[PDB]
Amino acid sequence: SVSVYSASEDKVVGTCPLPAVFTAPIRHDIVQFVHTNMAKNSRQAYAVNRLSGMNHSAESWGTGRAVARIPRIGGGGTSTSGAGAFGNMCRGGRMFAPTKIFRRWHRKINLHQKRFAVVSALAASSVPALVMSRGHKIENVAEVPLVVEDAVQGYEKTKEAMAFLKAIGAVDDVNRVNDSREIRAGRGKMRNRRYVARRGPMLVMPDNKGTRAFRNIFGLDLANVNALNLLHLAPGGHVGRFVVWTKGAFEKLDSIFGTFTKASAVKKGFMLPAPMLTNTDVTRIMQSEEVRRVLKPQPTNGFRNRRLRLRLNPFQKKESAMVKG
Amino acid sequence: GVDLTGVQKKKRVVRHHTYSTNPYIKLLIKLYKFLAQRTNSAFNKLVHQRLLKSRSNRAPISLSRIAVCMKRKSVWLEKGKKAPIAVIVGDVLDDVRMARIPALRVCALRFSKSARERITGAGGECLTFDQLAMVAPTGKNTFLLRGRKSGRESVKHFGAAGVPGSHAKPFTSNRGKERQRSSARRRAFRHK
Amino acid sequence: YGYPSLRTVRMMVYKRGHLKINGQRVKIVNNQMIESKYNNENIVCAEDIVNQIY
Amino acid sequence: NHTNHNQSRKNHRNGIKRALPMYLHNSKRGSWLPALINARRVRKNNQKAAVKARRERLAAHKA
Amino acid sequence: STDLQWLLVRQNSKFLQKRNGIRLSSDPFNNNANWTKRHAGFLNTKAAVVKTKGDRILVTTKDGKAGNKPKSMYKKAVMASVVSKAVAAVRPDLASIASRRARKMASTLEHMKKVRAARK
Amino acid sequence: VKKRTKRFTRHKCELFPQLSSSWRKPRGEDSPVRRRYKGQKAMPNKGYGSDRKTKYITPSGFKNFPIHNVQDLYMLLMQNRKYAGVISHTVGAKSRKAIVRKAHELDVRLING
Amino acid sequence: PTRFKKTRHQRGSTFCGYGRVGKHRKHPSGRGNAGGQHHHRINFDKYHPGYFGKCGMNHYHLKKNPLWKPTINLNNLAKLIAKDEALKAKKGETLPVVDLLANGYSKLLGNGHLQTPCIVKARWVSKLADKKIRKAGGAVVLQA
RNA sequence: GGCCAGCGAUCCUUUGCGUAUGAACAAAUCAUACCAGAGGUGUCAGAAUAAUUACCACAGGGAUAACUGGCUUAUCCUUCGAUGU
RNA sequence: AGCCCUUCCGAUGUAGAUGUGGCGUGGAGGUAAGGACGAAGCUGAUGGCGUGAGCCUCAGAUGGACCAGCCUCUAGUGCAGAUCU
RNA sequence: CCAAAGCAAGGUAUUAAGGCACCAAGUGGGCCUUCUUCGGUAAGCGGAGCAGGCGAUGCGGAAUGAACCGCUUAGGGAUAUGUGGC
RNA sequence: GCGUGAGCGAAAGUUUGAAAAGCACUUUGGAAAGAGAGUGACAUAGACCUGAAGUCGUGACAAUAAUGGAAGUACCUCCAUUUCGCCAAAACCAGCCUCUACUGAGCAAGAACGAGGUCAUGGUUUUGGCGGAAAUGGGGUGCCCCCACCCGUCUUGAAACACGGACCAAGGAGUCAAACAGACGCGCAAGGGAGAAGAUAUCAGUACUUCUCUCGUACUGAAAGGGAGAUUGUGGUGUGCACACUUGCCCAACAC
Ligand SMILES: [Mg+2]
Ligand SMILES: [Mg+2]
Ligand SMILES: [Mg+2]
Ligand SMILES: [Mg+2]
Ligand SMILES: [Mg+2]
Ligand SMILES: [Mg+2]
Ligand SMILES: [Mg+2]
Ligand SMILES: [Mg+2]
Ligand SMILES: [Mg+2]
Ligand SMILES: [Mg+2]
Ligand SMILES: [Mg+2]
Ligand SMILES: [Mg+2]
Ligand SMILES: [Mg+2]
Ligand SMILES: [Mg+2]
Ligand SMILES: [Mg+2]
Ligand SMILES: [Mg+2]
Ligand SMILES: [Mg+2]
Ligand SMILES: [Mg+2]
Ligand SMILES: [Mg+2]
Ligand SMILES: [Mg+2]
């Protein structure tokens, strides 16, 4: 079970059972495979112009002219005359394999793996070691998962919300973000990516009506239970994000993803995947008494060295005594 | 300064680590690697190596084919001997062709939602390798099985078709394209 | 090649003698080493070896 | 040019594989047929008594 | 379980510090900063640390009983085999190191009083 | 005590100013160096691997470990006889004042303090 | 992923696995399937034996919709019958009824050992299916 | 069949043979199909193929002539991104 | 930078195949961090580390503002030779 | 099958891990030599058989040598050699 | 700019600095310029960010085909580390190595005693030497002795009297798509998957779904057409992990 800490203060307003989703398998490889392919759909076509580098009249001067047979720009009166052209090697010439608008830019992911992943990344956020492992400052957090009173979405003013974030202890991971903000390294900064900052807590609203105060409140991403995004559940493709569930968003989290034993009410015949291991700590088995019971419980030269030979051939001294005379 | 002639040809190619990215296989290899080393049992040595195989070489088994191979095994068992656990290092798949199956106690990496429900509709347990290790740390009356792979459609393509002995399946999007008059064909049969 | 003297046999088996053990090339050092290799009530000593190969 | 040099070397790399054991691809087929057909009549009867034998062993094993 | 978690955070985490190919843990709760499952106490159901606390040795502890309530999952206790006696109270295997850190925490504290005083 | 103390330089780096001294494996049938004639330069190989328990160990006897800030020093608090912090080149002389009077207080070694 | 191509491995090895001799050209043989009857003759005959020729009657303007007769075996009628509905089906009692057009099947081939009766309802049936289906106490009822 | 050499794909034509198709239906015609032969590819595992170029050209080749050294008494080893008869 | 230790056998290599918690580059999702007490870049009897690709540090009596690490993603990604441009 | 129930057929020395599959490359100018030859007046010539080599490979030696001799090769030291020497 | 023309067609970042504050004035010069001075945080920021290589000038220095390898040594080291430990030498133990019998004086012949060597063998210190410097290591330059044919290339064969090769910088070459295949990873599995599209919530993404379609579960025949269980269950048999029991069942798998 999980206590529902009030937005107003430290005191819990009650407990709710964990939805089965948090018990679901954590499979980082699928969150990574789904994240990897899923991140490509945001992605956008680039290509060189169809006819760049090739926009010249050019002919090789042939052989017999003490010059490479690369095509040469013709005419005269210019710097580019006689200049090599078209080949990938030349100035002003064509790129090797010119980029096309019909690269496979986007990906298919099976609807089930996309779901296996949102499951595994929520289950990965229920685990405080994974969640503090990925970067979040969760040390003030009352509990994980951090479900929270439903009226936290009733806030209008942003600093009503800022008061809320300090209450649940989330502000240390929001300070993590405001401080993490700086000009991007490298080219990305002249490409409308000038500012990068770290992912912070992801508040998860029961429905669309909650947002307002939590907009603008930087380093606090908002999420909707009815459209959880694996790009947000596992930033970097690493499971374990910090999520502040609202009580309303949380109680309907098995209505959405379903049980191991009961189908999702929204995702058709989807049902949480069965663990491959009923007892996922192998080390506890190995150390178990049922398993412990079955467990399975200097001389070189031997001819001339005296002690070695006397060891290989115990009788040798009885034999050496025979040698005297 | 050594004859080595024929030594390299005797080198064997074996998997020594799983290529599986799946965390649970790795906790499962973590177990049976241990259990295979720390026990004298040959069952742990098989579950451990099969567990290292390709999903290609871990072929799925029909629950139909477990019920067959199991009763065929258990029918001879002297009275008061409960039937062996039906371990497989692979998925277990439901079979529509066998509606009613015995209360089997299958143990496998993975079960179809159909296999798991039919398996429990018969009252049989659908246990994992975790409690397989906890109930049969040694392969004590486990009945390790493999799913089939000869009927796999990839191997229907092995060899040439045009070669006389062969009944290889030619690669063709077009079934009617390489169809041929009975006269022109390779001889079907041929002695090796 | 030729016909080794008993002494030639001693020197090779004691000095240069190496058992195959688990495919390992193992320098003879113990008679324990030899009885384990040769599970043979006949072959226990390094003297058992020199008699056999002589 | 037709030199057969390096061929027995290249052939004994993977050995001369020795021929298949007699117990394997021992198909008849093109065997003198009349014998071959009588053999089917016996083998089919071996099958009915093999199965009939196992039916016996089980009934015997219900005891 | 921890067997699973460690196999998740093992290739990357905030705490792994794979610098120059060397691998140390930035983990607050690891005792010798060795990126190992035995030590990755942020991950373990139970954990023990023997950090300094202003001249005093501090021995943060994490019995599993708190479970997943990070605000109170860790319980400090200020305080030489006695500190090891406390750490073994939660993690018996950590104790041999928890003693040796608990010493080295002392020599550090003695060494710096000599250094901080000498900085005058 | 190292196998080889010399760099394995690229063949004929000395004649061509543009060529970096950094190693490239020679190719070409006729390369004197890959045909490994005796008077030629050597090529790197597994056999020049350093002894494996003295490997990575700087003459100070420490394995260097990168350090960027004062918190990193505690990554070396308990293994201060094995690792020696080498402060990153780009930490400010500002911050290095802080790393250094703290790397002193902790008994951790620093390569560039 | 460009990272993984062996293009990237053999950066430095001058001929990218094409050989110093016998150089990597262009079309050392023809484009596509050129010489299927010449210099690639040994190849198609070994692997694509029926590839050359003509075999049968033409069917100008084939219409596959009229030809659409997908099949379900007796051995697979549990796929259609509800497991709950199928629970008790004595041959002399009430039976699950299984329209096959609904389920997308047209003929009913009489493959394996059906043993649970059903009133299969399908456009076509095998000689052996209607027989097996009756012997199980069920009944195909013809539909269209 | 006359021991052992005496012979040949695909497409096409053609002949035979015992039903099948010409797909809204039906019969006849026609055509097609299956099936088994035949017509032939002698460059014989099978394009249907005349010269010339000193006005010539290109990609190469020392895989290959003359030439150039060598060997021998013709070879083709060097050289055809040129070693002047 | 292999969990530790022990023992044993092997080690050449063109074409080629494969491996690599292998190197390195531009970019991206992450994480972590650095910078006007001086980022990148560049210079270097600056040493140190690595078999090596290389990394790191030192010093600039260089620079003037950005940016390394790590895991994942990506590619217009590594050059003495093309009579290469 | 036999005239037949007997015949036929199927059934109650040293050493060394064996076999099988899949996918795929390069290659498809070879050269020399050993011995055996064939052709040629002869060749550092054309052609084969055998095996070994060079190619792809150094190292040591024959003063020198692609293929001779010895030996074949991780980074090093001692020892002792091989062909060859003093 | 080029071409009669049709047409071809460049290079060029004014990116000094925060600002021009863009060097007034003195001084030499005919001038260009120079020397001062001045501005600015910086003018080796001066009409110009950075400021590489290569090339050149200069100073100082080591020196006497090239390069190169190996190893030393001479000198120098704005380098590293260490010491207030480093170089040595001797010993001890271990290891290791070296240095009768028969026969009719000989061998085809066996040990022993004794002694030596050695740490580029292991363990035991001892004793001395050195200690703003020492010391080990690296780096640099020279030498010495020694080794060492220009690389890339096609080729049986390259040092070739075979081709390409003056220097450096930037660039430069297995790419993208698609259709198959094998392998490997993942998902579900007798099913799998969607696509187009839609509907929604909030942003070309994520979430959601109908209906279908598609590959598959059935094959075969030219085709009309037909279409596979055994005697509540492996079709049999042979060989066949594991487990069971002291032979059974055999999984897969091959074969028949
Ligand atoms: Mg361009
Ligand atoms: Mg231009
Ligand atoms: Mg099949
Ligand atoms: Mg040829
Ligand atoms: Mg190569
Ligand atoms: Mg290739
Ligand atoms: Mg070429
Ligand atoms: Mg080719
Ligand atoms: Mg060729
Ligand atoms: Mg057709
Ligand atoms: Mg021909
Ligand atoms: Mg020639
Ligand atoms: Mg090799
Ligand atoms: Mg780019
Ligand atoms: Mg220099
Ligand atoms: Mg490129
Ligand atoms: Mg010589
Ligand atoms: Mg400038
Ligand atoms: Mg030639
Ligand atoms: Mg099929």
From TrEMBL, chain A:
Key word Iron-sulfur present: no
GO cellular component: ribonucleoprotein complex; ribosome
Single GO biological process annotation from the record: translation
Keyword terms: Ribonucleoprotein, Ribosomal protein
Gene Ontology molecular function: any one: structural constituent of ribosome
Record Pfam families: Ribos_L4_asso_C, Ribosomal_L4
Domain Large ribosomal subunit protein uL4 C-terminal: start-end pairs: 268-325
Keyword DNA-binding: no
Signal peptide: none
SUPFAM superfamilies: Ribosomal protein L4
Family indicated by similarity: Belongs to the universal ribosomal protein uL4 family.
Name of this chain's protein: 60S ribosomal protein L4, putative
Taxonomic source organism: Trypanosoma cruzi (strain CL Brener)
Lineage: Eukaryota, Discoba, Euglenozoa, Kinetoplastea, Metakinetoplastina
UniProtKB/TrEMBL annotation, chain D:
GO molecular function: structural constituent of ribosome
InterPro entries: Ribosomal_eL29 (IPR002673)
Record bears the keyword Ribonucleoprotein: yes
Signal peptide: none
GO biological process assignments: cytoplasmic translation
Keywords of the record: Ribonucleoprotein, Ribosomal protein
GO annotations of cellular component type: cytosolic large ribosomal subunit
Region Disordered, annotated ranges: 1-16
Superkingdom, natural source: Eukaryota
Family named by the database record: Belongs to the eukaryotic ribosomal protein eL29 family.
Name assigned to this protein: 60S ribosomal protein L29
Organism: Trypanosoma cruzi (strain CL Brener)
Automatic annotation (TrEMBL), chain F:
Alphabetic keyword roster: Ribonucleoprotein, Ribosomal protein
Cellular compartments per GO CC: cytosolic large ribosomal subunit
Molecular function terms, GO-annotated: structural constituent of ribosome
Keyword set includes Ribosomal protein: yes
Tagged with keyword Transmembrane: no
GO biological-process terms attached to the record: translation
Annotated segments matching region Disordered: 24-53
Family statement drawn from the similarity comment of this UniProt entry: Belongs to the eukaryotic ribosomal protein eL32 family.
Protein known as: 60S ribosomal protein L32, putative
Organism: Trypanosoma cruzi (strain CL Brener)
Portion of the full sequence shown: 11 to 123 of 133
UniProtKB/TrEMBL annotation, chain G:
Domain of life: Eukaryota
Amino acids binding Mg(2+): 17
Similarity comment: family membership: Belongs to the universal ribosomal protein uL15 family.
Keywords of this entry: Metal-binding, Ribonucleoprotein, Ribosomal protein
One GO BP: translation
Residue ranges of coiled coil: none
Protein name: Large ribosomal subunit protein uL15
One MF term in the entry's GO annotations: structural constituent of ribosome
Family matches, as SUPFAM superfamilies: Ribosomal proteins L15p and L18e
Organism the protein comes from: Trypanosoma cruzi (strain CL Brener)
Any one Pfam family match given in the protein's UniProt record, by short name: Ribosomal_L27A
Domain Large ribosomal subunit protein uL15/eL18: 71-141
Matches recorded under InterPro entries: Rbsml_uL15_N, Ribosomal_uL15, Ribosomal_uL15/eL18, Ribosomal_uL15/eL18_sf
GO cellular component: cytosolic large ribosomal subunit
